[model samples]
Target chain A: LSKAKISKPAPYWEGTAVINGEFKELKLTDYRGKYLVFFFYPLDFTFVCPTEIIAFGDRIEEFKSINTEVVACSVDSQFTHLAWINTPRRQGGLGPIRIPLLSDLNHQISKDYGVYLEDSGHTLRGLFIIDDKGVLRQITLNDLPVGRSVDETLRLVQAFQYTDKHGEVC
Target chain B: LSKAKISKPAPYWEGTAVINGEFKELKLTDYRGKYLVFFFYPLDFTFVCPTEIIAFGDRIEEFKSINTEVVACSVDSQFTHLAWINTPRRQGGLGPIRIPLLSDLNHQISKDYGVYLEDSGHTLRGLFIIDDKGVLRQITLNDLPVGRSVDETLRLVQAFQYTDKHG
Candidate 1:
């Protein structure tokens, strides 16, 4: 009955995501058998966290190699995600990204993750690590001024993967 | 009434705090004139986070110079906090901390801060920066495996203080 809990099944999510410049219906079930790096940012047009999306996109292959899929989401619509992707990187846009930018226009996904900022109508920089079995493992939430570290995300994922395989090797 | 929110007055908190091995009642209003670095850890007997308490204590002067006070809290009772403080750092205890260790044995403060883990009956590693005016300015929450950065806490406190006085 709780929103999001560690060591428990990740809350199920299904929504429209912009992948390869096209809108596609993506759901949590689609990511089964692979770890998921699902994250949420404040908004699309805001400069508070401009590079987190691209950082994950650029380093997606590393996550792929570890059997993990990364996805980004915000309160912005899927159309906005596509627009930001179509815009060039030099001109302050995402250009093309390997990760799907899921649209939580109605704020359901953010609400379920417990990162929803009801007073501001947006989400905090909340990142979650869902394992291959769909259990939520880790969570990190930062305020607006600070951006999340992509390297840290990778480390956590690898640590989880390593633990799952070797059973908490010391 | 909602939980903790940035750019808004922090939720009021009043409870017994272990100050210098003495149990004294403390409230949020007590820190009105100075910025407050209020934080929550998981538990007292756990090794999940043993250093954060001392890191803030070792750097208490840095925060005091900036007109800010540091306070650490957990679901542990006042007796437990005092016991941990009395225990030496070499023995896996906090060892005479400079800041007050607030006891939220009832979990009201954690629930108000929205960092309470209902299933675990404890709190995550949550930190808050409340300005001198009593408005919450920044928040950072980390799960069990990861500890928080004391330097980053100082940086955020300085940033908010700078913005408040300058711009």
Candidate 2:
């Protein structure tokens, strides 16, 4: 209903986010000519969410090698995002993420992405892959109870990258 | 690495499969109790994989549904599994169904359970719901490429029904 169809190119992401201990406004245009992997989860301090966020964080370099940058989004506020990052992993916190963790406090990002669960006032597990041209090449969604596969995600990214470079899906 | 680990339960399903309308032996006990939603993907059909198989197919309901019984193994042989189901949707195939799509060739129950992927040596996307009792509770995997909804899979089943009845 939000017109967030996968067939069409992804809309530009322009919003304020907390990245590497700094608050800044970002947009999809800024990352043009580079692959982007954007994912959204429900909240911080919840189960199954941090596992994915930190997984991406740990593999930040691999993504960067493919000219891809990872960005995690949630409906929580910037303050909550930072606090969760500072908390240790053993305490159910992310400690820190290599990529920017955007705070969609107003839930606008979730709405734009069509991953928002209105009833729960949170976003579902949604993962989007945007090509160098800023077009959403692939989109994956899962229920909140189930976690996602970073290995599969990376494989998809690699597949897309290979296709882009070779002009064929290998 | 996730602390949240889930163990596969008992009552495996090892029996003959019905692939391409052929009756083949399959084993249901192998994945007993462990959360599994065994589904049948209809033949090598296009456009159907993305909307049907890949969408809800990857998120096996077995994990979320307590005490298991969501198997999505297909009748297409392991070779087909590696070829078509493993390929991405954009490439005119139902790429990589995370759960095992059991090879059900030999018509073991393709017609019995309905929805065999015959045209392309595959099975229709039919869902089979087995419980800890090792009994086939619900069988509703649909036609090839016709995606199934996980929400419905989690609802109105014997386990949930029992919960509502007892609790």
Candidate 3:
């Protein structure tokens, strides 16, 4: 059921996203010429702090400065994502996120990305670095308890970008 | 086509392996109570230097000391694996490999691992960390030219072990 493969075209996905406090349709192709750090967290407002997701939002400028766009997705509805975004981080919610929060209510995107958890009906903490050419370059999957590293994600994006521009593996 | 899933049973694999210069049948369940670092390379011999493979062989004690076993696989046959192991590293061959080099001649293992390069008829540099409990824990996939970090692999193994023991 997993369709994602490294060095191949990423599985196409189109879904509703909450960008800048408004619902907008976002697709995979929209990030054609820029590096995309597409990641998935398990849920919107889990008991465990969404520190990794908030870290991406807190440091969005770093990715933008390097021509990379960050997008976060989960199986939760857009309404749930918007509510969490509206809530303050002090209250254990993602407050004022700069990146788009895409909703995969149907779980299709998670399945395509190979992060869908069948028994749990959610996703693992999976992060994919898609380069400018739309090739799935790197994949890092972490279990539920382990939070992914934001710095590591940045390093991978930069690595792929360097490899693309210099025509060499990073 | 990829059957491997994190937090689930790793796809079962049974194949012929050249372990320490002898042929033996190796399967996924053989490593039930120990961590398994199952990895894949592109081929037995390639133009690029196999420093990564050799590094795994050289630093094998590090993995073994921590209750882990390392197994490398590719689409090459067991005979090819033996030949490569017999060749010296100075001459572009993996000489005296300490870890078992499992052969995946039919490419079934590569496909099941999700690292098979269909067009190239080989596999990418993919690594999976299966915990002692037989649950798939971590996965890191690299392109052909990019080599993986042996230190990172060790850290992940340790992390999973800690999680399992404490929780």
Candidate 4:
């Protein structure tokens, strides 16, 4: 709880982003109705980065089918993200990622998310699950070495959805 | 000069790093050589990023042949670098790249290099070639968007070596 950024409503964020294969300026409110699986990463072009970024993109449809929206962010500017998105994974680019890659260029978003590493200038892996009402239901933090898990994230999502729908905590 | 970082010799940095497919603790002075090409990168897995990192690796031998050693550094810890190095080029990892990727986990090294972006936690692309005497001969910095050229780095290296040798 001491270093938690998901204790309440997500820190407000409205900024430029690279999304759906294009650069756009969007806001946190835009994805309000659906569950928001917002995540913070350190930078664009490093190890374990593409694995998680691509994993989320690969499962974007699965998330959407469950009324969830995936948003990825890092300290990189939108321009860097676009270049990465256009790059094929085989070539070490993100390669056609569907989700919005928000730019925390100023690091406001990562700081708000409580994941920005001030000493290193990179954000820790802080992933949040926000419900339709903006209530943060889950917060996950991973050390830089461990890449996040899509399967585990989905399990939490399904469990939460079930609790919301049938009042049984999963 | 305002952003020059090789003061009093490249700032002493020792941390965990994966080198030649093995994890080890290393320090800056450990790389004593005729010349050292020490560089800073934003991170491991992004664009223009791979191009530069891999390029440096691809030319490791050329650097060595010129009496120079290439050491790539970033704010990323050694483990992430390992994952990237182990990763294939088609999949965006460093792919058995030869040069050592230094970890500025605390950012002291990047700050010492004067390229640490205060707003963001990562270092700017700062490249320096240090002479055997520990004097910094060249300094190059690129804003995050642009990738550096190994050709240009080598070009300058050749020019410097010529100036030193043929003098």
User: What RMSD, rounded to one decimal, does every model reach?
Assistant: 19.0, 19.2, 21.4, 6.4
Could you tell me how far off, in angstroms, the CA of residue A23 lies in candidate 2 after the best superposition? 1.3
Please give, for residues B75-167, the per-residue lDDT of candidate 2 as tens digits: 433333344543345645565554444644343445455554333333456666655544555556444335677668766454654763587
Better lDDT candidate (1, 2): 1
**TM-score for each model:** 0.50, 0.49, 0.50, 0.60
lDDT of each: 0.81, 0.62, 0.81, 0.77
Every model's DockQ, to 2 decimals? Answer: 0.01, 0.01, 0.01, 0.14
Count of clashes in candidate 4: 9
Model 1 reaches an interface RMSD of 19.6
Candidate 3 — what's its lDDT? 0.81
lDDT of prediction 2: 0.62
- Across residues A50-116, which tens digit of lDDT does each residue of candidate 4 receive? 7777788888899989989988888765655765676667766677877889887666677777788
Candidate 1 structure quality by residue, lDDT tens digits, A1-170: 23789999899999889999888999998988999999988766444337788888888999888888999988665655665666566645577888899977556678899887754556788998999888999988898668878899999988888888697866
Q: Residue A143, candidate 1: how far off, in angstroms?
A: 1.0
- After superposing candidate 4 on the true structure, give the runs of residues whose Cα lies further than 4 Å from its correct spot: A1-8, A14-26, A37-108, A116-170, B1-7, B42-62, B65-67, B75-80, B83-95, B103-108, B118-122, B133-137, B143-167
Of the candidates numbered 3 and 4, which has the greater lDDT value? 3
Clashing pairs in 4: A45-B44, A45-B45, A45-B46, A46-B44, A46-B45, A90-B90, A92-B92, A121-B121, B84-B94
Q: Write the per-residue lDDT of candidate 4 for residues B32-52, one digit (tens) a residue.
A: 767888898887666444777
Per-residue lDDT for A17-116 in model 3, tens only? 9998889999999999999999888876555788788788888899999999999988665655665676567755677778899987657788899998
Candidate 3 chain A minimal-lDDT segment of 10 residues: A79-88
